[PDB]
């Protein structure tokens, strides 16, 4: 009905957790519905390709992973989910890409190869180092690389969610990160998405 | 001052595209061909500010951004005038999707063909894989341009995906790949499309 938009989503899928975190942020009247709890006939009606986070309103239907979130932030402008300062915004637009490209794959590779425990033992050891050396490199800022909530945070929020559901958890032994994660999960956006 | 530094390499279709947008903006920018041995000095630099001497790279005092989309967006922030994108958030996204297609299909493949260790069978396949989806592609790029132009006749923005493709034809022509089309005015369009002034100025 009046559900201006509806977001169809899969469970344990960052791409869908990213979208739900930002739609909450936009105080939007949207219907949310799951897959697996749909007719094998309609799932193909809305998104013919099994891509899965799919946002559809009256006369448009979208799911392009790398483009969806930018669209939400643009379609429902207030509140803005990008920086105001040109330069900041410019490099957030880059950190986004690096994220989607160098970090999200580590996720799949923690899953697709997860039915084996000797590989995991090492991968978790890597994700350990890769963060260990940055947990210092970033500090003194409320959220990620900005003053306020960015898409970048939506990205990371969701990513962490999936990883700690793989068994990868962030401890007291990272630092400004653990509390940055604490702050992340402090937000009413991230909390209705985690449960 | 406006110390914008664009790192490039000769015949690198990405660079050529960023170089022709910057022209349109009227942005002042020190272009830097890293292929040229005079700039051994800047190439040393680049490999400090990018994980893999990425090209092209748009460097300023505050940042060093690479990757086409990021760059193209980056320029839109910096030099708003004239507009590179549509304005309706639906059409903006569509172009973002299309640009991501044209890229994985022609833009990066164009770059594989420039490697001197490509295995004679490899490319023939690349080229022909390219020939298949190019016309359909062009046709998509137009349709969308007819839409966005008509949805706002007063906006008067440029179609970045039309510019980008002009280059994909110019490299089809550079690599001796045929453009399979009989259609009269498609070829008329193509020819005119390569005859737009700033394109020449870029080359």
Residue numbers in the entry:
A (entry chain C): 0 to 194
B (entry chain A): 2 to 204
Question: What is the paper's account of this structure, in its own sentences?
Answer:
A previous study suggested that another small molecule involved in signaling, the inorganic polyphosphate hexametaphosphate (hexaMP), binds the MglA–SspA complex. However, we found that hexaMP did not compete with ppGpp binding to MglA–SspA. Moreover, cocrystallization of MglA–SspA with hexaMP revealed no electron density for this small molecule anywhere in the structure.
